[PDB]
């Protein structure tokens, strides 16, 4: 009664307590979800209405552990605020309880800021692609100065040649660069296709630098001289492969033919990602 | 003089000039 409604209304006060206090805390880690969640009343959220909702493949920033059943964090999305996240055991328990009444881990740890990776317009290690990507890296360096780190990744991180240890340490380095929520951009030599990082926990923002016309790409390659035109076919084949991918495999597609327009598009996207990852106080 | 082919051709000229300029901007960094 109000015998009981002493404790189970002081619990709600003590929960709202921690929740406001975590608003200022740093992000402990991020996860990419493999499942969706929307709270039902019977889920017994420490503060009613304060559970977050998400779909599979969303990203969550986790601040702290409230108890064994609930974490505190936010959906990485503009406007979304701190709330309760069900822990994996709580998700399992809801399923099990649901089955009883009627009678694949849910989270992957990923960097707190998704690393930006550029693919296209063709293969890296040739002039057209390396130079076009270089101009983009240089733009970002100044456009996001003070909020960004751009780093070369020579080790073959798609292997998660390069030893296992060398790959693991580069992966750990990328996680660390993102820990304080600055933008992270990789110049990753070996990555030419989005499917190359799909099995890692890097969860990149994949930027497709796309030349719409194969004729245009061929002419660009030829403009580099016969030392590059010797390798025309392998570059043309690779660009055609990117062009066959469904657009949803890419987070950003830069098909603008002017550097400044491609830069503005990418900057607008990353500025919005900055907002999604840095909620107002 | 198929007009569609004419504007396509002009679009490809613009694309090429744009990308050539893009590459040049990378070269002088
Ligand atoms: Br609820
Ligand atoms: Br939410
Ligand atoms: Br995201
Ligand atoms: Br928040
Ligand atoms: Br439950
Ligand atoms: Br700038
Ligand atoms: Br930098
Ligand atoms: Br090895
Ligand atoms: Br991925
Ligand atoms: Br990984
Ligand atoms: Br074409
Ligand atoms: Br030549
Ligand atoms: Br040659
Ligand atoms: Br193509
Ligand atoms: Br896009
Ligand atoms: Br430009
Ligand atoms: Br955008």
User: What SS3 class is residue A253?
Assistant: strand
Supply A91's token pair.
């998700």
Q: Does A199 touch chain B (CB under 8 A)?
A: no
Question: How many angstroms separate the CA atoms of A133 and A115, rounded?
Answer: 15
Question: How many angstroms separate the CA atoms of A276 and A61, rounded?
Answer: 11
Q: Are the C-beta atoms of residues A153 and A169 closer than 8 Å to each other?
A: no
E strand or H helix at A85, and its extent?
A: strand A83-86
**Ligand nearest to the backbone CA of A251:** 15
Q: Where are the domains of chain B?
A: 1-29
User: What SS3 class is residue B25?
Assistant: helix
Closest to A257 measured CA to CA, from B9, B6, B14, B23: B14
For residue A214, give the chain B residue with the closest CA. B12
Q: Are the C-beta atoms of residues A192 and A243 closer than 8 Å to each other?
A: no
Put simply, the answer to whether A257 touches B12 (Cβ < 8 Å) is no
For chain A, what is the largest distance between any 2 Cα atoms, rounded to a whole number of angstroms? 87
Quick one: residue A181, left, alpha or beta (phi over 0 = left, psi -120 to 50 = alpha)?
A: left
Q: Does B15 touch chain A (CB under 8 A)?
A: yes
Q: Burial level of A247, CB count in 10 A (0-12/13-18/19+)?
A: exposed
Query: How many of the other CB atoms lie within 10 Å of CB of A204?
Result: 26
Q: Does B26 touch chain A (CB under 8 A)?
A: yes
Supply A95's token pair.
């399923």
Closest to A17 measured CA to CA, from A44, A42, A41, A50: A50
Count CA atoms within 13 Å of residue A230 on its CB side: 4
Domains and CATH numbers, chain A: 1-111 (2.30.30.40), 112-281 (3.40.50.300)
Q: Are the C-beta atoms of residues A115 and A174 closer than 8 Å to each other?
A: yes
According to DSSP, residue A180 is labeled T
For residue A210, give the chain B residue with the closest CA. B19
Q: Does B7 touch chain A (CB under 8 A)?
A: no
Q: Does B16 touch chain A (CB under 8 A)?
A: yes
Q: Are the C-beta atoms of residues A60 and A135 closer than 8 Å to each other?
A: no
Query: How many of the other CB atoms lie within 10 Å of CB of A251?
Result: 16
Put simply, the answer to whether B22 touches A216 (Cβ < 8 Å) is no
User: What SS3 class is residue A185?
Assistant: strand
Shortest distance between the Cα of A188 and any Cα of chain B, in A, equals 18
Report the residue of B9, B13, B18, B24 to disrupt the A interface, i.e. the one with the largest count of A CBs within 10 Å. Answer: B18
Report the residue of B12, B13, B20, B26 to disrupt the A interface, i.e. the one with the largest count of A CBs within 10 Å. Answer: B26
Inter-CA distances, A165 with A102, A171, A214, A256, A274, Å: 48, 10, 39, 39, 31
Question: How many angstroms separate the CA atoms of A279 and A189, rounded?
Answer: 33
The Å distance, Cα A268 to ligand 17 centre, comes to: 5
- Residue by residue, DSSP assigns A153-167 as E-S-GGG----HHHH
Q: Are the C-beta atoms of residues A193 and A119 closer than 8 Å to each other?
A: yes
Residues 127-156 of A with CB under 8 A from B: 127-128, 131-132, 134-135, 138
Resolution value (Å, 1 decimal) = 2.0
E strand or H helix at A186, and its extent?
A: strand A183-188
Put simply, the answer to whether B12 touches A128 (Cβ < 8 Å) is no
Chain A contact set for B5 (CB, 8 A): none
Report the residue of A219, A221, A261 to disrupt the B interface, i.e. the one with the largest count of B CBs within 10 Å. Answer: A219
């Amino acid at each position: 009664e109000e015998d009981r409604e002493a404790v189970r209304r002081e619990a709600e006060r003590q929960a709202q307590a921690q929740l406001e206090k975590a608003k200022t805390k740093p992000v402990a880690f991020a996860v990419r979800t493999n499942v969706s969640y929307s709270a039902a009343h019977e889920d017994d959220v420490p503060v009613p209405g304060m559970a977050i909702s998400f779909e599979a493949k969303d990203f969550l920033h986790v601040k702290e552990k409230f108890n064994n059943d609930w974490w505190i964090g936010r959906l990485v999305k503009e406007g979304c605020e701190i709330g309760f996240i069900p822990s994996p055991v709580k998700l399992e328990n809801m399923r099990l309880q649901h089955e009883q009444r009627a009678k694949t881990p849910p989270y992957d740890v990923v960097p707190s800021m998704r690393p930006v990776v550029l693919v296209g317009p063709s293969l890296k290690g040739y002039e057209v692609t390396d130079m076009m990507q270089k101009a983009l890296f240089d733009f970002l360096k100044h456009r996001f100065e003070g909020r960004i780190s751009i780093t070369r990744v020579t080790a073959d991180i798609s292997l998660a040649r390069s030893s296992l240890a060398e790959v693991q340490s580069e992966i750990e380095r990328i996680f660390e660069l993102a820990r304080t929520l600055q933008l992270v951009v990789l110049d990753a030599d070996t990555i030419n296709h989005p499917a190359q990082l799909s099995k890692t926990s890097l969860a990149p923002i994949v930027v497709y630098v796309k030349i719409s016309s194969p004729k245009v790409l061929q002419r660009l390659i030829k403009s580099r001289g016969k030392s590059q035109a010797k390798h025309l076919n392998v570059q043309m084949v690779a660009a055609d492969k990117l062009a066959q991918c469904p657009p949803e495999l890419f987070d950003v597609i830069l098909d603008e033919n002017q550097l400044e327009d491609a830069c503005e598009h990418l900057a607008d996207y990353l500025e919005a990602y900055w907002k999604a990852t840095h909620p107002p106080s | 003089g198929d007009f569609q082919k004419l504007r396509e051709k002009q679009q490809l000229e613009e694309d090429l000039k744009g990308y050539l300029d893009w590459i040049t901007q990378a070269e002088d960094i």
